[model samples]
Target chain A: DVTPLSLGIETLGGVFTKLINRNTTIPTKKSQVFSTAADGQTQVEIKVCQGEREMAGDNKLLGQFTLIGIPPAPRGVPQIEVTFDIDANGIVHVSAKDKGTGREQQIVIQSSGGLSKDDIENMVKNAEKYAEEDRRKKERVEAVNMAEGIIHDTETKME
Target chain B: DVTPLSLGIETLGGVFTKLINRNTTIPTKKSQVFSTAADGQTQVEIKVCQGEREMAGDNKLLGQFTLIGIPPAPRGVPQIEVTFDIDANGIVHVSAKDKGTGREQQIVIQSSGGLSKDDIENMVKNAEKYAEEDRRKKERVEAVNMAEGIIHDTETKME
Candidate 1:
């Protein structure tokens, strides 16, 4: 099954988030480790951008959510593993594994883009209208051809 | 020169209105013929869409204007040639030359993407943010290297 949007995800170490979404193949899977940005930091904000931009602010934002229940420790002390798996039908599931305790949690991702409900509906309507118009054009051409043929046959009979 | 949007003024024609903007390169140009759809009418509506779709409904509309005052005659008798030029910066200009009168009219294109103001702000902010981040990262990495070098030299001297 093909989806409208292609997804791209990357793992950049110094960056807070590890993902770039574009040309994403269906049924995709990826994993990365998350390290603490600063020593003894209580939390980390994972901001997701949904485009080809290298910066989070430059890309269209899917959303920003945080991982709770992280044990406070020095930077690089905690070894957290994250896994991303998207199936052929465009369903994406993300799982995070905490290395210290071997715990894992999974979540599903929805899409956000320029398309609105009305916009999608209008696209479909336009597609249908074009199809109908194409049929009408063909019919008109066929009718004109038939008329010319009949007129020619009459002229031949008169001769 | 830094204009990032593509612009054009187009006259009415078949499915030409549904062009996905990014599909065409910046500074693209096209010359199109606009024959009156009506049997005896000389004027035609010129609607241009900037979005990427195969039909009118899928594209985001830029603006619609009409070209009037044509020398009225049978259908396809009057030939008005219009040229659309999109510069590398994506600024579009339209010029129409009436062969019968040997006169030309140039139309300035106005963008309708509704993000003109915000896009300008983003263009500057993103530029600065990328630059600052690069500077900081480089400085921090150099400092880390210097500290490692000093520690290695002191240990060798002690030995």
Candidate 2:
């Protein structure tokens, strides 16, 4: 399904700036140029958020990150282009780069809640319970499935 | 330089399960199989983390996600293989799949921190101060950089 809502980052005045609007198709790439909100702004606080609210605080915060090494410039003097790329599996890869200096930072936000503590306990326990069983099978399985030899087939098709 | 530390997820008992070990070459792909810890666990929480600590709690959290719809089965019965792939630019793309059901989710975590609030004010003001000026130039620059027509070249190469 397409994104249930918008995916964005917090901008000046803690506003939600949507990079990819809601209902956009999955596995897409979009980029926008952003500037420093102040003079001599050496960095940007990228508060990764998702929702339709105008204010960032009203939205769900998937995570927050920082982009540093921006060349000091007048507010809006520097061009910082941020890209929001979402793949087919709902992985959100966001990156920002100072077009002038080439300084950049990146972050990964899941865009969705995760499994609970109870959920984790069960999986952890199961691994231990089947510890001996898994070891024996793991050894035998690794011997096969040579996850190789397919590069040769690709070579044939390349030319 | 390669990753200064490892990147991984938290499993049972807050143990750090490294998907990409420290000092591995950049732009590498690695995969490992994991299983449930309970007899009827329904979900798995992927707590994206990084660092050298063996315990997840001591590491830096990049993000977290969930892969639901696991068929209820004995712990260790479900074979969930996760792959951690990092590109040359240091963006980490992580994925997990239940070899049985194919249920999966993903998240992106920026490996480093970012800019600050003082820096934001400067950029925000700049965007507004040059709003009139930017509007005029933005209108012109965007019109010229037609980010199209490049696919035609790729088609020729393909042939």
Candidate 3:
């Protein structure tokens, strides 16, 4: 294989920004700085996804976890450094550190396929039926995120 | 909220070529033609992965199924028409049809997040320990695929 796929995390406005991009060699590590997107945001949901797209929703989400206990500050103030590490075998570990508090958390995932036995754990069948329902839920979240952004801009300007 | 994630399939040598790319509006359907990578390849493992990377292992494997009954033929001779369909909520269905034998197979996967009930279905706590073993296995497959391509090329030229 000449190149491997990309590794990325979700940022402000639901953007899927890459720390390590396509065609990058294995056994690599990369880190990037990201900040909260909402005003007075106390926590951030680090949604880790993989894809070539620029939008988080446009990529396949591998897994995600929340980083809480962030100092209550205006958006884009607290610096959360996110790192991605991949070994030769495509096993990946993602970690985030709150620069101010030193609070950290990490997740491990095998980017490669899993055991044949685990492949059959459970299968979701005919989920097309629920597409509309999920769309509505996602739209609500989008609305909330957008509103939060607007409030942040208004407050930042007022200050 | 305009373009959802891409939907694609795995083709020759672990490539993650996308059928529908990023920023593409949802509720879309797209199909593409792919051929066998190995000679006398009677069955194709239609691995449905999502991403923009050309390397299949680089992207996230959504799900997969086998399409059998392909008439034995030289590499790059058979026609496998793979189709990808995505709804507004990013529910995706991938299907493969052997144009000659009319054999077909498919698997459905929710490209978007699953129910909170299912997300915790089972998390492989730490598979990093087995990365070496998996790497060895993948290297074996890589060697085999490369050898198969060489034979196909030699045979085609000799014929």
Candidate 4:
């Protein structure tokens, strides 16, 4: 089984912040808090990203929107809450809210940066087919480690 | 968004049998009934695999076990039910039961053949970082397609 899919958003530093990690079960909701970066900032841009990269520019951009009318607050004074919700169908809904004013901007990322049904089916089948190879590799490594352990034990006994 | 994980088992014919399709919401359970391949068979082997491959040997094997103590009977006379459950944490629980005697064997596969938490976080971050490049590639394709469409239309009109 695979981990739940991951949800990420771009921060002011142009880096990705993960809201939900991959392999998590579906129908999941996760939220993170952010704030203004400067004095008298009235807008915030939320760039939604997918995939496993650390840099915001490196991942797949699903959607993006800006939240305005923030009451011109100082840096870190205004609170913004971003929420990501992944439904059963693998669709993601991302929303950003002005925690103080209740103003919000939201977008639905439909099948962006996500595998199609056919892709998933192929992946599942491939994982099963390659299992034997994985097992053999693991067995080989275990055998090597066991032999090393035995050699070390014999040398210690002789000493 | 993430691909739906699939659950599969090996049939007596040594072929991969998909119990669940990918993109299905998680915290899911699926079951299928199988039978003995020969008369007076007292044991059955359950091979659990992951992925989209058609061959059992081609996929990644999560685990396998044998269920013994089956009452000897004619071929295909005994019914064995196999169930797979994936929880929110992305862990899998596989169980096999004999319908006639209610005998069962179950096992849990934890983080086996799945990416680690660190790997997932990195993937999410990378997806966001590469989104710009993806957008540019799409735009380039669109531009080329548009140019070709215009050329085709003009040639048809002149002819």
The best candidate in terms of TM-score: 3
- Cα lDDT, model 3, residue B90: 74
lDDT accuracy of residue B30 in candidate 2: 88
TM-score of each: 0.32, 0.36, 0.37, 0.36
**How big is the positional error of residue B20 in model 2, measured in Å on the Cα after superposition?**
70
**Candidate 4 lDDT over residue span A25-130, tens digit each:** 7777888778765557888888887655544565567787988988874344466888988788778888988888999889988633456757545544554675
Model 1 misplaced regions, further than 4 Å: A1-21, A112-159, B1-159
Candidate 1 deviation (Cα RMSD) = 32.1
**lDDT at B126, model 3:** 22
> Residue B98's C-alpha lDDT in candidate 3?
82
Minimum summed lDDT over a 10-residue window in model 3 chain B is located at B150-159
lDDT of each: 0.47, 0.63, 0.62, 0.64
* Candidate 4 Cα errors over 4 Å, as ranges: A1-5, A111-159, B1-159
Worst-scoring 10-residue span by lDDT in model 1 chain A: A150-159
User: What digit string (tens of lDDT, one per residue) describes model 4 on residues B62-89?
Assistant: 8888887888864454668889888887
Model 3 regions lying over 4 Å from their true place: A1-159, B1-3, B114-159
The digit string of per-residue lDDT tens for model 2 on A16-115 reads 6788887798888988777664557778777778766555665678877777887664444567777888888778999988788888888877753435
lDDT of 1 at A120: 41
TM-score of chain A of each: 0.55, 0.68, 0.67, 0.68
Candidate 4 chain B: worst-modelled 10 consecutive residues by lDDT: B150-159
Best by lDDT: 4
Docking class of 4: incorrect
